[PDB]
Amino acid sequence: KQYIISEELISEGKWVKLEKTTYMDPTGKTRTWESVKRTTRKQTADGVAVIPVLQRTLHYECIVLVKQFRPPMGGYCIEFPAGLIDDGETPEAAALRELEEETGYKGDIAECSPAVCMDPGLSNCTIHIVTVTINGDDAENARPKPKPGDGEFVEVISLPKNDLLQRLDALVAEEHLTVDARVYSYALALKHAN
Amino acid sequence: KQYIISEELISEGKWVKLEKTTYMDPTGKTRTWESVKRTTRKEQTADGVAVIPVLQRTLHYECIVLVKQFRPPMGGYCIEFPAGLIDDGETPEAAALRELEEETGYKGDIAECSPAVCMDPGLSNCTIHIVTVTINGDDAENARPKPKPGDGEFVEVISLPKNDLLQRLDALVAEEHLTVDARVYSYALALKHA
Ligand SMILES: c1nc(N2CCC2)c2nc[nH]c2n1
Ligand SMILES: c1nc(N2CCC2)c2nc[nH]c2n1
Ligand SMILES: [Cl-]
Ligand SMILES: [Mg+2]
Ligand SMILES: [Mg+2]
Ligand SMILES: [Mg+2]
Ligand SMILES: [Mg+2]
Numbered sequence: 001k002q003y004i005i006s007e008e009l010i011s012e013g014k015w016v017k018l019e020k021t022t023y024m025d026p027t028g029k030t031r032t033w034e035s036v037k038r039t040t041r042k043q044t045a046d047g048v049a050v051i052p053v054l055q056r057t058l059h060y061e062c063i064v065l066v067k068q069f070r071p072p073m074g075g076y077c078i079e080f081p082a083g084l085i086d087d088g089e090t091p092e093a094a095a096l097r098e099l100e101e102e103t104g105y106k107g108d109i110a111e112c113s114p115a116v117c118m119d120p121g122l123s124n125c126t127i128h129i130v131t132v133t134i135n136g137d138d139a140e141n142a143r144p145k146p147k148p149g150d151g152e153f154v155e156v157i158s159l160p161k162n163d164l165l166q167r168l169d170a171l172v173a174e175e176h177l178t179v180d181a182r183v184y185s186y187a188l189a190l191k192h193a194n
Numbered sequence: 195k196q197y198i199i200s201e202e203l204i205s206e207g208k209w210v211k212l213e214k215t216t217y218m219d220p221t222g223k224t225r226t227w228e229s230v231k232r233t234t235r236k237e238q239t240a241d242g243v244a245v246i247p248v249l250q251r252t253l254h255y256e257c258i259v260l261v262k263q264f265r266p267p268m269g270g271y272c273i274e275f276p277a278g279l280i281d282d283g284e285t286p287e288a289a290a291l292r293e294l295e296e297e298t299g300y301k302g303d304i305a306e307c308s309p310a311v312c313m314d315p316g317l318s319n320c321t322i323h324i325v326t327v328t329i330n331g332d333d334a335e336n337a338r339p340k341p342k343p344g345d346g347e348f349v350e351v352i353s354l355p356k357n358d359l360l361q362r363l364d365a366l367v368a369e370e371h372l373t374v375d376a377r378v379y380s381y382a383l384a385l386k387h388a
Pocket of ligand 4: 082083
């Protein structure tokens with residue numbers, strides 16, 4: 001019933017562009033929307049985000065998150081490890097690569113989502129959510145070395161899975177960080193389960 | 195360590211703007227970023243709300259109430275938590291309850307309200323509160339709920355059992371071209387992982 005008629009370029013940067021989208025509303029009336037897109041899409045999606053389950057015997061299972069300065073937010077955010085998918089890279093490979101560069105951990109793929117949208121009222125941006133386990137008892141994950149690319153500066157924060165929502169709430173209250181909505185949604189569901 | 199030095203307007207729409215952000219990196223070097231923001235944020239603690247609406251009814255499994263709508267930035271249909279922007283002077287809770295009623299017809303009761311969480315912090319400053327609301331589906335008000343769409347709003351309600359949400363979403367994606375929202379998928383994955 002609804003569909004895109006045309007897209008008008010408004011402004012194109014190196015990384016991001018803004019378009020004016022014309023679309024048919026379901027009454028047969030023509031309407032416009034201000035839409036954001038990345039200029040980098042090739043890929044199944046723009047990016048990947050990794051849900052990294054750190055498994056160490058005799059410890060609680062942890063979810064590994066990252067903290068970085070985010071210029072659009074003007075502050076520090078707590079997020080799943082994540083990055084854009086390289087041209088000709090599979091989402092699974094992007095997931096292990098980004099996880100290693102951002103955290104130093106070497107993980108194994110558990111499952112991979114379909115492309116999912118980030119903020120569909122605003123942008124066309126999509127990601128694959130890739131669940132990865134990390135065997136924290138393996139020697140390669142003993143002293144995990146983060147490999148920050150040029151212009152990346154990432155702190156690693158591992159939080160127990162069974163208390164994740166309360167641990168995040170505490171970080172927000174004391175550290176004045178912004179938690180990512182996907183991470184928050186994951187944490188809420190861990191509490192809402194059963 | 196890191197902070198914003200300047201924000202230069204590149205292009206300003208009715209709803210969305212694009213900025214060149216200058217910031218200080220942690221080595222002490224000046225760098226730039228292309229940043230998206232909405233034009234509609236005033237004194238609100240966030241741009242919008244998304245609602246996690248848990249439909250509860252005697253002798254029924256709990257359901258998660260979702261909405262399906264055409265999203266012009268995506269060029270197609272998306273499955274999302276009910277959501278909208280917070281009106282000026284409106285609380286996030288009030289906005290949640292109001293958007294849930296407008297989009298679904300249901301009258302919920304507040305359960306919890308998140309701090310402001312970021313939508314896509316490598317791209318935009320956009321933030322929401324995630325508001326958990328229970329719906330008493332035994333109450334007569336919630337028997338035959340009718341959405342009250344705004345001008346240009348055309349929303350379908352999809353209620354899925356919490357106990358099988360991820361599979362039910364996968365089955366929806368298998369049957370039509372539609373995209374699931376990343377917060378919905380994250381919530382569904384944690385329900386499985388718990
Ligand atoms: C048109 N209307 C929008 N509104 C949000 C409430 C109506 C919008 N948001 C991002 N781009 C947009 N273009
Ligand atoms: C600068 N660099 C960006 N990226 C480095 C990897 C994507 C970017 N993304 C949105 N805006 C941006 N401005
Ligand atoms: Cl898992
Ligand atoms: Mg990253
Ligand atoms: Mg990177
Ligand atoms: Mg809405
Ligand atoms: Mg609405």
